[PDB]
Amino acid sequence: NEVVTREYTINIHKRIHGVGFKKRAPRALKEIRKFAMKEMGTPDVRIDTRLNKAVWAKGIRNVPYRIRVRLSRKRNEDEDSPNKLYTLVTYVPVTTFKNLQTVNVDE
Amino acid sequence: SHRKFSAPRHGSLGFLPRKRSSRHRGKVKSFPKDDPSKPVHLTAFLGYKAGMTHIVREVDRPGSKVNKKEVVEAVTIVETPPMVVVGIVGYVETPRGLRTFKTVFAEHISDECKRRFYKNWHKSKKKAFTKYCKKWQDEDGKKQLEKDFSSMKKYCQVIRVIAHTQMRLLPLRQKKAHLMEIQVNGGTVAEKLDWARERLEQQVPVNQVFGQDEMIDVIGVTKGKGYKGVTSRWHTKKLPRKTHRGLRKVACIGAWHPARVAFSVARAGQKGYHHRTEINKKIYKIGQGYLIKDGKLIKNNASTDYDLSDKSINPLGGFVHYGEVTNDFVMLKGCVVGTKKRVLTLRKSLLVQTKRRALEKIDLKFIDTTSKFGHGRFQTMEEKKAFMGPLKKDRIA
Amino acid sequence: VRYSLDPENPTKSCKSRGSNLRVHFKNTRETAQAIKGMHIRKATKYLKDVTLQKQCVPFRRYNGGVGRCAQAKQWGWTQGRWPKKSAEFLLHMLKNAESNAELKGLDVDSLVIEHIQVNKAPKMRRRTYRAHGRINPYMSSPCHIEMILTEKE
Amino acid sequence: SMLRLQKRLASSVLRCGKKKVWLDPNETNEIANANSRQQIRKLIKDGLIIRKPVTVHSRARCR
RNA sequence: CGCCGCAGGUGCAGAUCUUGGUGGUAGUAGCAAAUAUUCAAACGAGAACUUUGAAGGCCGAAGUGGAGAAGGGUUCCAUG
RNA sequence: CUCUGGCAUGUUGGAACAAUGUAGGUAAGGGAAGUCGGCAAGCCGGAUCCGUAACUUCGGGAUAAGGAUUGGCUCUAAGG
Ligand SMILES: [Mg+2]
Ligand SMILES: [Mg+2]
Ligand SMILES: [Mg+2]
Ligand SMILES: [Mg+2]
Ligand SMILES: [Mg+2]
Ligand SMILES: [Mg+2]
Ligand SMILES: [Mg+2]
Ligand SMILES: [Mg+2]
Ligand SMILES: [Mg+2]
Ligand SMILES: [Mg+2]
Ligand SMILES: [Mg+2]
Ligand SMILES: [Mg+2]
Ligand SMILES: [Mg+2]
Ligand SMILES: [Mg+2]
Ligand SMILES: [Mg+2]
Ligand SMILES: [Mg+2]
Ligand SMILES: [Mg+2]
Ligand SMILES: [Mg+2]
Ligand SMILES: [Mg+2]
Ligand SMILES: [Mg+2]
Ligand SMILES: [Mg+2]
Ligand SMILES: [Mg+2]
Ligand SMILES: [Mg+2]
Ligand SMILES: [Mg+2]
Incomplete structure (x- = not known):
């Protein structure tokens, strides 16, 4: 519907590639x-x-590669x-990023 | 007075307005000269630059130092799936030049061809040539069309075939096809017209257009570099380290008294994205693509009768920034303008090849298929995994 | 007070003005020339498109040094910009005009900008400091604006 | 609203820095209507203003 | 103001004239010395810039810290 | 580099990453052929142990020149 909630992982590395040190985060x-x-x-x-x-x-220029939101x-x-x-975007702590799909989570 | 030490001209004045090319394809601008004694054939083709690798062959050059020895030469791979002839245009030569008399298109033109005809295929209704194929299927339109064919036969002097590439066989993002006029040579106008209308709505392979170990010309658009200064654009000498307002300049642009900057001094501007026509590019091999007889076979690519392996022309990890070649390819000797995925006009030569450097039958010993995504050291996956044995992921698998 | 170009019918027209407005005169004049002749709903949506940078204002007269934009090909030209302050001042004046129209009782969904002009206002004076102990002017270029809308559909 | 006076005055009555004064972000109104010492002192006694602990500079490595 | 007389500090395009005003340049040059910001909330018509909290940073005790002398004169402090 | 204390990047922000710049690097093979001129940059650099020339006002030159060593960890002696 519209009260929906999912879980994604974002490749910040490819979204961040090439930008300056004081601008990465x-x-x-x-x-x-x-x-x-x-x-x-x-x-x-x-x-x-x-x-x-x-x-x-990890500061302004060493941003994590993948984040789980x-x-x-x-x-x-x-x-x-x-x-x-x-x-609302929240932060999901994980150990590994392997085999991690995009998942609809319940209420 | 007297520039005091002779130095030749930096750069060529035969190549300038040194501006961006107005086209992306590459216009032929000169087809081979027609003699009706030859059979009917095409004179050009349209390929795509896949990548580069290198080969090993044995040279037969008497008197040369590399006679009957093995050399290594760089090659360029051009993917050339067969082109679909879908139209035909005729030209009459006038005292003002050479003007197009009449075009005739075919019934059932494909969607990538119509994609070429549209600038926004997504928002369009895709209505192109619908009323035209109506007159093809009609009978009043049919006698009109053969009347146009007969008028073209009795008046035109130069006929050309409109053919498009079929982009659904390529690993590229582009679905819009490339159209091209390819001159038809070698016969009377009636003969080449019935030949072309036989080949209408149909596929033409590079095997039929070109041949083994002939020298052709490559026409294309030079790799783009953007706005460059005079040191990159014209290769002028850099000024010494203690120069106040910049080093990478030309220190003097003309004398006082022609009172104007001439057109022949070096200036900053666009470098690259230039239309070039390079000649004497020797064909080393014409590939064969991925045919299916049974459980299929790809050795018809780079299996060279001295290795007898089962490898394709594709390196490990594929061609960098291109994809993989699953169609007929052409291996040329040397480097070729443009980026990867750049469309290359390839055409027959318009000189005559009487040279022992030319008219030479080659024979490949080896074709290098190591990975170009690094310092790749294996030819095939079987060779790599046989050299390394089982891995941790293989063991847990 | 005393408008230039009094309208044809001062019962189906509504007018609005504003004086000593601290927006750039050149930018507002280009925006006013772009807005002239439009319907009122189209003019409001266009000026909000300007402030969101979805549609440009073509700079035709005061165009020296103005960059090039793909959105000027609508108003077929090559130079365009997105004057935010000019757009918001013109939107304020347009809503004052529709308020005057509903006050005097006209159909607000059928008004068209029949007249709009931008005059220069008196300049306000500031300073800037220069190299060898010099002080140069740092003036502003405010403007009077006036517009007359007209009921027509 | 604006808690500059309360931040300064709390640093005064707590004998620390404004970097160490912590003002409750939820009880912003009850902090904002405190224009005096003894009002700051009442807020400290009821725990709406807190002196923050020093950020640690350990000596375990050099020891 | 016209006519008859009378009397001048009596006629401007210039003087790198003087004073005042306004252009083109031009929405241009520019708003680039000293590493750096970001998320949320509040107040508010309106928030990249205010305040609060959290984070990441800097000055690094020969300080971007805490106090004074000259000098300044109310700039100090609350409220709006 | 960090703590106490202080701050918000020095009179604005956003988006791109062309030329020319300004500041900073790196460079195969040669090694001053560059240039008025080794300008500029580079080389060297601390400490410990050796070893130090001409000349001299006998003080110096002198860190002359030249060479070796240098981390981590586990001990053993000696010095109150
Ligand atoms: Mg000469
Ligand atoms: Mg100089
Ligand atoms: Mg490579
Ligand atoms: Mg200009
Ligand atoms: Mg200044
Ligand atoms: Mg001064
Ligand atoms: Mg006088
Ligand atoms: Mg005058
Ligand atoms: Mg005169
Ligand atoms: Mg500018
Ligand atoms: Mg600037
Ligand atoms: Mg520090
Ligand atoms: Mg002090
Ligand atoms: Mg800065
Ligand atoms: Mg700032
Ligand atoms: Mg300041
Ligand atoms: Mg070198
Ligand atoms: Mg070297
Ligand atoms: Mg030299
Ligand atoms: Mg020399
Ligand atoms: Mg010399
Ligand atoms: Mg030097
Ligand atoms: Mg000496
Ligand atoms: Mg050791």
Whole structure:
């Protein structure tokens, strides 16, 4: 429906390839923001502070290669904002990234 | 006064407006001269640059130092699936040049050809040539069409065949086909016209257009470099280290008194993406593609009668930035303009090859299929895994 | 007060002006020339497209040094930009105009910009500091804007 | 709202730096209506303003 | 203001004239010395820049720290 | 490089990564052929153990020149 939640992994390495040292973690964050927008369709994505910490975990220029996030399109009926659907992006800690599919998670 | 030390001209003035090419394909601009004594044939073809590798052959050059010894030569691989003739244009020569008299297209033109006719195939209704194939299937339109054929026979002097490449057989992202006019040579106009309308709606292979170990010409668009300065663009001498407003310049552009910068001094601008026509490119081998008789077979590619292995022309990990060759290919000697995936016009020579450097039958001993994605050291996967034995993933498998 | 080009019918027209507005006169004049003649809904959607950089303002007269844009081929030309401040000032004036139209009781869904002009305002003076103890002017170029919309469908 | 005065005044009554003063991000209104010492002191006693511990500079490596 | 007389600090295109105003240049040059920001929330009509929290960083005690003398004179502090 | 303390990158941001620049690197084989001129860059560099020429105002020259060693870990002696 529209209260949906999935789990993705993002290849920050190929989304970050080539950018300057003092720009890699901010570039990674707006790459995540664009990825979340395009996987959903909603503007107003909100990046969780733990996800911000995970992106910035090794400083500004050694960003992790793959990140495991949970996207969740949720209702916005708490502010009278022009769009009724926002997307919260949270951070999923994992050990390995092998054989990890995109998975719909339950309520 | 008197530049005090002779140095030749930097760069060539026979090659300039040194601007971006207005086309991506590569126009022929000169076909071979027609003599009706020859059989009817085509004179050009359209391939795609896959990549480079190198070969080993034994040279038969009497008097040369490498006579009856083995050399290594770089080659370029051009994938050439057969071209579909779908149209035919005729030309009449006038005192103003040579103008197109009449084109005739065929019924049932393919969707990649119509993709060439459209600039946005996604939003289109794909309506091209529908009213035309209507007049092909009609009977009033049919007598009109043969009347056009008969008028072309009695008036035209130069006929050409409109053929497109079929991009569904290529590993490329592009689905839009490439069309081309290929001159038909060797006969009377009636003879070549019935020959071409026999070949209408049909496939023509590079085996039928070209042959083994002949020298052809390659026409294409030089690899693109962008806006460059005079040191990269014209190879002028760099100025000394203590030069105030820049080193990579030309220090003087003309004298005082022609009072203008001439067209012949070196300036910064576009380098590359240039239309070039290189000649005397020797064909080393014409491939055969991936045929299926049974459990299929790819040795008809680089099996060279002195190795007898079962390897294709493709290296390990495929051709870098191209894909893999599953169609008929052409192996040329040496380097060839353009990027990988760049479309190359290939045409017959318009000189006569009487040279012992030319008219030479070659015979390959070895074709290198190591990986070009690094310093690859194995020819085939079987050779690699037989040299290394079982691995950890193989063992757990 | 005293508009240039009084309308044909001052019962089916509505007008709006604004003076001493701190937007660039040249950018706003190009935006005004792009907006002239449009319907009011099309003009609002276009100016919001400008502020989101989906449609450009073609720079035709005050075009020296202005870069080239693929969106000028609609208004077939080569130079275009996206004046944000000009777009928002014109949107404020357009909504004031539709407010005047609904106040005097006209069909707001059938108004067309019949007249729009941009005049220069008096300049406001600031300073800049230069190399050998010099001080140069740092003036602003504000503008008066006026527009007259007209009921016609 | 704006807690610059409260940050400065808390650093004063806690005898530390403004880098060490922690203001509760949820009780922003109750902090914001505190224009005095003894109001800052009340907030410290009820735990809405906290002095933060020093970031550790260990000597285990050099030992 | 016209006519008869009378009297001039009495006629401008210039003087690198003087004072004032305005152009083209031109929406141009430019807003590039000292490593760096990011996420969320709040207030608010309005947030890249305010405040709060979290993170990542810098000055690194011959400091971008804490106090003074000259000098400044209210710049200090709250509120709007 | 870090702690206490302080800050928000030095009067703006975003997107790209052409030429020419400015600042910083690297470079096969040669090794000053470059240039007015080795300009600029590079080489050398700390410490320990050896070993140090002409000349001299006998003080110096002198770190002359030249050579070797240098990490980690486990011990053994000697020095209150
Ligand atoms: Mg001479
Ligand atoms: Mg100089
Ligand atoms: Mg390679
Ligand atoms: Mg110009
Ligand atoms: Mg200045
Ligand atoms: Mg000064
Ligand atoms: Mg006078
Ligand atoms: Mg005058
Ligand atoms: Mg005069
Ligand atoms: Mg500019
Ligand atoms: Mg600038
Ligand atoms: Mg530091
Ligand atoms: Mg101080
Ligand atoms: Mg900076
Ligand atoms: Mg800043
Ligand atoms: Mg400052
Ligand atoms: Mg070298
Ligand atoms: Mg070397
Ligand atoms: Mg020399
Ligand atoms: Mg010399
Ligand atoms: Mg010399
Ligand atoms: Mg030097
Ligand atoms: Mg000496
Ligand atoms: Mg040892």
